[PDB]
Design a protein around this motif. Structure first.
Motif, short mmCIF file in Angstrom:
data_model
loop_
_atom_site.label_atom_id
_atom_site.label_comp_id
_atom_site.label_asym_id
_atom_site.label_seq_id
_atom_site.Cartn_x
_atom_site.Cartn_y
_atom_site.Cartn_z
N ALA A 92 0.83 -1.20 0.00
CA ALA A 92 0.00 0.00 0.00
C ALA A 92 0.87 1.25 0.00
CB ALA A 92 -0.94 -0.01 1.20
N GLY A 93 1.87 1.30 0.88
CA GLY A 93 2.82 2.39 0.86
C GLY A 93 3.81 2.31 -0.28
N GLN A 94 3.98 1.13 -0.88
CA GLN A 94 4.91 0.99 -1.99
C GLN A 94 4.31 1.55 -3.28
OE1 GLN A 94 7.87 1.02 -3.62
NE2 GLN A 94 8.41 -0.56 -2.12
N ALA A 95 3.01 1.34 -3.49
CA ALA A 95 2.38 1.67 -4.76
C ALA A 95 2.28 3.17 -5.00
CB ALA A 95 0.99 1.05 -4.84
N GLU A 96 2.39 3.99 -3.96
CA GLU A 96 2.40 5.44 -4.16
C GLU A 96 3.68 5.90 -4.84
OE1 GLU A 96 1.78 7.27 -0.41
OE2 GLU A 96 -0.33 6.70 -0.27
N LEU A 97 4.79 5.20 -4.61
CA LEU A 97 6.05 5.56 -5.26
C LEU A 97 5.99 5.26 -6.75
CD1 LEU A 97 8.60 4.28 -2.62
CD2 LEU A 97 7.97 6.64 -3.10
N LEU A 98 5.29 4.19 -7.13
CA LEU A 98 5.18 3.83 -8.53
C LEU A 98 4.28 4.80 -9.28
CD1 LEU A 98 4.83 -0.04 -8.08
CD2 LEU A 98 6.93 1.32 -8.40
N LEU A 99 3.21 5.26 -8.63
CA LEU A 99 2.29 6.19 -9.26
C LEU A 99 2.90 7.58 -9.39
CD1 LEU A 99 -1.07 5.07 -7.61
CD2 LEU A 99 -0.24 4.59 -9.92
N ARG A 100 3.84 7.93 -8.52
CA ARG A 100 4.56 9.19 -8.67
C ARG A 100 5.69 9.06 -9.68
NH1 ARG A 100 0.63 10.42 -6.51
NH2 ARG A 100 0.28 11.74 -4.66
N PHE A 101 6.66 8.20 -9.39
CA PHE A 101 7.87 8.08 -10.19
C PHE A 101 7.94 6.68 -10.78
CE2 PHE A 101 10.07 11.46 -7.37
CZ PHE A 101 9.47 12.46 -8.11
N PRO A 102 7.84 6.53 -12.10
CA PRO A 102 7.73 5.20 -12.72
C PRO A 102 9.06 4.55 -13.11
CG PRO A 102 7.34 6.86 -14.36
CD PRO A 102 7.58 7.60 -13.08
N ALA A 103 10.19 5.23 -12.91
CA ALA A 103 11.47 4.63 -13.26
C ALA A 103 11.84 3.49 -12.33
CB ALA A 103 12.57 5.69 -13.26
N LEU A 104 11.39 3.54 -11.08
CA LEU A 104 11.64 2.47 -10.12
C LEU A 104 10.72 1.28 -10.31
CD1 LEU A 104 12.03 4.47 -6.79
CD2 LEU A 104 13.88 3.49 -8.14
N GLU A 105 9.79 1.34 -11.27
CA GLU A 105 8.86 0.24 -11.47
C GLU A 105 9.55 -0.98 -12.06
OE1 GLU A 105 7.24 -1.06 -14.46
OE2 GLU A 105 5.93 -2.35 -13.26
N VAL A 106 10.60 -0.77 -12.85
CA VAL A 106 11.32 -1.87 -13.50
C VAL A 106 12.09 -2.76 -12.52
CG1 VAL A 106 13.02 -2.46 -15.26
CG2 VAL A 106 11.40 -0.60 -15.67
N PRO A 107 12.98 -2.27 -11.63
CA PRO A 107 13.70 -3.23 -10.77
C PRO A 107 12.85 -3.79 -9.65
CG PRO A 107 14.31 -1.06 -10.11
CD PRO A 107 13.41 -0.88 -11.29
N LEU A 108 11.69 -3.19 -9.38
CA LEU A 108 10.85 -3.63 -8.28
C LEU A 108 9.83 -4.68 -8.72
CD1 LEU A 108 10.11 -3.07 -5.27
CD2 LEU A 108 8.57 -1.32 -6.14
N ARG A 109 9.31 -4.57 -9.94
CA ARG A 109 8.24 -5.47 -10.38
C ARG A 109 8.77 -6.85 -10.73
NH1 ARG A 109 2.87 -6.39 -9.64
NH2 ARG A 109 1.96 -7.38 -11.50
N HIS A 110 9.96 -6.93 -11.32
CA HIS A 110 10.48 -8.21 -11.77
C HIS A 110 10.83 -9.11 -10.58
CE1 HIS A 110 10.64 -7.38 -16.05
NE2 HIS A 110 11.34 -6.28 -15.84
#
Lengths: 37, 71
Positions: free
Chosen positions: B22-40
């Motif tokens: 829940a607290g993690q998904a706010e970072l993805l909705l703001r800044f999407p560059a960190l979505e790649v190393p976190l999702r895999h």
């Protein structure tokens, strides 16, 4: 001239080493895929 | 680098992939560059680590040795 005793070597020459029985199962040859080293 | 620390400082979490989603998904909705190393689930490098470069050298060093003793 040059003089020598001489031995012809062929591919039929071979060497038969002997291993100890507990030698072959070693911690080095049996490392896992992930180590702490 | 500001967004990683101060979001996880109040959460008191040591690693950003250990954060609650829940607290993690706010970072993805703001800044999407960190979505790649976190999702895999399995990247080639352990994410958010500084010695992750040096681990890549040593993981090859084990796979080089492990292929020797079997062959």
């Amino acid at each position: 001239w040059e003089h020598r005793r001489f031995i012809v070597a062929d591919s039929r020459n071979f060497i038969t080493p002997e291993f100890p029985r507990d030698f072959w199962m070693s911690p080095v040859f049996n490392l896992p895929r992930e180590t702490a080293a | 680098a500001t967004a990683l620390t101060e979001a996880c400082a109040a959460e008191r979490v040591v690693r950003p992939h250990q954060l609650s989603p829940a607290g993690q998904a706010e970072l993805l909705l703001r800044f999407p560059a960190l979505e790649v190393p976190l999702r895999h689930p399995r990247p080639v490098l352990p994410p958010f680590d500084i010695a992750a470069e040096v681990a890549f050298t040593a993981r090859i060093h084990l796979a080089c040795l492990r292929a020797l003793g079997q062959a």
